[PDB]
Amino acid sequence: ELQEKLIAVNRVSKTVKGGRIFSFTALTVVGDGNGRVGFGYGKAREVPAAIQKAMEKARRNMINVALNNGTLQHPVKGVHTGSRVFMQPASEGTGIIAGGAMRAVLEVAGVHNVLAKAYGSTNPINVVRATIDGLENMNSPEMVAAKRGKSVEEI
RNA sequence: AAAUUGAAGAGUUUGAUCAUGGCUCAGAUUGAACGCUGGCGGCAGGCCUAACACAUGCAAGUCGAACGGUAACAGGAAGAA
């Protein structure tokens, strides 16, 4: 049913008496092409073992986001650790113009049209956190009608 | 009626990590030059340096309806023939 990218694969390491124990991190996002998105981050001693642990960790751990016609409601910021991340809704036929890890997250979230920009660090893991941080706090016209107790021509 | 619709990152410090922070790259542009190559046309462009020095030709004349005029070369006239 649902779409599932592999962003990144580091090799990490841990020292012992012997010498080095190498190990692999992978990093994946999944999503329903229609405003749900998890990311998961696996580790294992082999690489295909690790992608699998991530794809599982992503399915559970997966959040809703109200899009509008396949783009954002309004121009959002977002931040995690070093990565700042600004995204802006776009007119139809821009495409997803956007960085490395950003571009994955938005594609499977089912955003079709955005102007992103990553300032700060661009560490893949902290950017997909900062991007999702952005998208989940972003808020629909129907939510704010409810907040303030209206339903105006602002709708 | 229409007169702007616009914003991508990557590599390199560590055994590994996150951060800071430099170096480098991917684009557009040019009165360009150099190298290898080269069929045709259209429209543009062409001493950025020595405001260094210049042979040769040409780049400001016109007016006889302002004037006295004849040296030219066109006729005409008296007149040698």
Coordinates of N, CA, C and O (backbone and C1' of nucleotides) in Angstrom, one line a residue, chain A residues 10 13 20 88 94 98 103 116-117 122-123 126, chain B residues 5-10 15-20:
Chain A
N10 N 25.0 5.2 7.3 CA 26.3 5.2 7.9 C 26.9 3.9 8.2 O 26.1 2.9 8.4
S13 N 31.0 2.8 14.5 CA 32.0 1.9 15.1 C 32.3 2.1 16.6 O 32.0 3.2 17.2
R20 N 38.1 -2.9 16.2 CA 36.8 -2.2 15.9 C 35.7 -3.2 15.6 O 35.8 -4.1 14.8
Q88 N 7.5 26.3 2.6 CA 6.6 27.4 2.1 C 5.7 26.7 1.1 O 6.2 25.9 0.2
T94 N 5.2 23.6 -9.4 CA 6.6 23.7 -8.9 C 7.4 22.4 -8.8 O 8.6 22.3 -9.1
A98 N 13.7 21.3 -3.0 CA 14.0 20.9 -1.6 C 15.3 20.0 -1.6 O 15.6 19.4 -2.6
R103 N 13.7 16.1 0.9 CA 13.0 15.7 -0.3 C 12.3 14.3 -0.3 O 11.2 14.2 -0.8
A116 N 11.3 24.4 -0.1 CA 12.0 24.2 1.2 C 13.3 24.9 1.2 O 13.7 25.4 0.1
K117 N 13.9 25.0 2.3 CA 15.3 25.4 2.4 C 15.8 25.0 3.8 O 15.3 25.4 4.8
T122 N 23.1 20.1 8.0 CA 22.2 19.2 7.2 C 22.5 17.7 7.5 O 22.6 16.9 6.5
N123 N 22.6 17.4 8.7 CA 22.7 16.0 9.2 C 21.4 15.3 8.9 O 20.4 15.6 9.6
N126 N 18.8 14.6 11.8 CA 18.2 15.8 12.5 C 17.4 16.7 11.5 O 16.6 17.4 12.0
Chain B
rU5 P 3.9 36.7 -8.2 O5' 4.9 35.4 -8.4 C5' 4.4 34.1 -8.1 C4' 5.4 33.0 -8.6 C3' 6.2 33.4 -9.8 O3' 7.6 33.1 -9.7 C1' 5.0 31.4 -10.2
rG6 P 8.7 33.7 -10.7 O5' 10.0 33.5 -9.9 C5' 10.4 32.2 -9.4 C4' 10.7 32.3 -7.9 C3' 11.0 31.0 -7.3 O3' 12.4 30.7 -7.5 C1' 9.6 32.4 -5.9
rA7 P 13.0 29.3 -7.5 O5' 13.6 29.1 -6.0 C5' 14.8 29.7 -5.7 C4' 15.2 29.5 -4.2 C3' 14.8 28.2 -3.6 O3' 15.9 27.6 -2.9 C1' 14.2 29.9 -2.2
rA8 P 17.0 26.7 -3.7 O5' 16.5 25.2 -3.4 C5' 16.3 24.8 -2.1 C4' 17.0 23.5 -1.9 C3' 18.5 23.5 -2.0 O3' 19.1 22.6 -1.0 C1' 17.6 21.9 -3.4
rG9 P 19.2 23.1 0.6 O5' 20.5 22.3 1.0 C5' 20.6 20.9 1.2 C4' 21.2 20.2 -0.1 C3' 22.6 19.5 0.1 O3' 22.4 18.2 0.7 C1' 22.7 20.9 -1.8
rA10 P 23.4 17.6 1.8 O5' 24.7 17.2 1.0 C5' 24.6 16.2 -0.1 C4' 25.9 16.2 -0.9 C3' 27.2 16.0 -0.1 O3' 27.3 14.6 0.3 C1' 27.5 17.7 -1.6
rG15 P 40.8 9.0 14.6 O5' 39.6 7.9 14.5 C5' 39.8 6.8 13.7 C4' 38.9 5.6 14.1 C3' 37.4 5.9 14.1 O3' 36.9 5.8 12.8 C1' 38.1 4.9 16.2
rA16 P 36.3 7.2 12.1 O5' 34.9 7.3 12.8 C5' 33.8 6.4 12.4 C4' 32.9 6.2 13.6 C3' 32.0 7.3 13.8 O3' 31.0 7.5 12.8 C1' 32.8 6.5 15.9
rU17 P 30.5 8.9 12.3 O5' 29.9 9.6 13.6 C5' 28.8 8.9 14.2 C4' 28.4 9.7 15.5 C3' 28.0 11.1 15.3 O3' 26.7 11.3 14.7 C1' 29.2 10.8 17.3
rC18 P 26.5 12.3 13.5 O5' 26.2 13.7 14.3 C5' 24.9 13.8 15.0 C4' 25.1 14.7 16.2 C3' 25.3 16.2 15.8 O3' 24.2 16.8 15.4 C1' 26.8 15.5 17.6
rA19 P 24.3 18.0 14.3 O5' 25.3 19.0 15.0 C5' 25.0 20.3 15.4 C4' 26.0 20.9 16.4 C3' 26.9 22.0 15.8 O3' 26.1 23.1 15.7 C1' 28.2 20.5 17.1
rU20 P 26.2 24.0 14.3 O5' 27.6 24.7 14.5 C5' 27.8 25.8 15.4 C4' 29.2 26.0 15.8 C3' 30.1 26.6 14.8 O3' 30.0 28.0 14.7 C1' 31.2 24.8 15.7

